[PDB]
Amino acid sequence: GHMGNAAAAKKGSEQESVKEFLAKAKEEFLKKWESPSQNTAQLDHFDRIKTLGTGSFGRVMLVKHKETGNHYAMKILDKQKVVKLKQIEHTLNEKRILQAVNFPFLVKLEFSFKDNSNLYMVMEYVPGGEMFSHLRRIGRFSEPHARFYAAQIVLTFEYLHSLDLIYRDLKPENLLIDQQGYIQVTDFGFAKRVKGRTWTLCGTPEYLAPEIILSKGYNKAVDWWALGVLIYEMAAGYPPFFADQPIQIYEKIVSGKVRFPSHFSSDLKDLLRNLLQVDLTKRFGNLKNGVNDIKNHKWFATTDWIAIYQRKVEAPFIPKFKGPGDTSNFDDYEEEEIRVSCGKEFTEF
Amino acid sequence: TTYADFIASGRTGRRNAI
Ligand SMILES: CC(C)(CC(=O)O)CC(=O)N1Cc2nc[nH]c2C[C@@H]1c1nc(-c2ccncc2)no1
């Protein structure tokens, strides 16, 4: 066969150890899920440094903890602007997930609290910014570079899916790069802890699986489709399906056709044809052998999955880092004030 | 070319969710 006896034995033992890990990790997750942490700090514990982002619901600020000197990213959501935007459930759920998960490629919620008017989530500051900026600057990543990131997403999805969590918003914009060059996944507002099927139209057009576009009940296989889109975009510098308008994007997604740049390796094209598979009964990640069809694919032949998990692999790229508190990998915003002074439904925060 | 078509798409910047 393909594997000699010693190689088959080592692979089998590796897969059983993963199962042992996931069992223990689901037990830890459920304990925190059932008994979340609340109000582990307060606003005056922090100095405001810089606004890193803003939107209709709130802003994200670089803050420094006054006593430890540690920098954090503080998400500030205004309770009234969330209640009046149909986002209460997503915000409660995102905080519930973040305080319960534990994985080396998920940004860590360090503190959370609320005051009279705002919700606050204080997470470890990831100073390298989004993969998006680096990808657009460099143009495209080499296949070994793309594989380094892809392997982390594979493990992160393997973790989340074992918790019955579908992630649903994979894209370079949501992948932060830390000081060791590893990925930190941000944003769990669209994630849903559901076995079986779910129906919500959500995600980003370029990354939508066909079954989402087609108004089907769908399952965790949409995350594996999105991995195919991400691997393609990392290696090509542009996603597999694009157009002027989303409706034209959706027609290409559902057509079951994808074209590859001539520099894509044969192994990469084969992996991507199996992830960007419209037919659910044939899409990798969704078959009898689960994630192992992906981890055992030829394109990942050189990947030491445990070494990736242990963060022992030297990253192919380390963002420039002029020290703690460096803001250079983020844009510049007007520094609006944070004023205090909607208890209903936010009781659980 | 595909790269040229990508630039022409106007979808090279950060993409919002639906
Ligand atoms: C203002 C909100 C919080 C809400 C909104 O408008 O909907 C959006 C926002 O500004 N986001 C969310 C986000 N998702 C992908 N990139 C981004 C950027 C930004 C964000 N940076 C971080 C972060 C975490 C840890 N270290 C460094 C940076 N955490 O959030």
Short mmCIF file of C-alpha atoms in Angstrom, two decimals, chain B residues 6-18:
data_model
loop_
_atom_site.label_atom_id
_atom_site.label_comp_id
_atom_site.label_asym_id
_atom_site.label_seq_id
_atom_site.Cartn_x
_atom_site.Cartn_y
_atom_site.Cartn_z
CA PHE B 6 -9.16 41.37 -9.94
CA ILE B 7 -8.00 44.99 -9.76
CA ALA B 8 -10.89 45.98 -12.04
CA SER B 9 -13.42 44.23 -9.78
CA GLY B 10 -13.11 46.98 -7.16
CA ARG B 11 -13.01 44.24 -4.52
CA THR B 12 -9.31 44.44 -3.54
CA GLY B 13 -9.92 46.20 -0.20
CA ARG B 14 -11.16 44.77 3.05
CA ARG B 15 -14.47 42.96 2.48
CA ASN B 16 -17.54 43.35 4.69
CA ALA B 17 -19.70 40.44 5.68
CA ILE B 18 -23.25 40.24 4.35
#
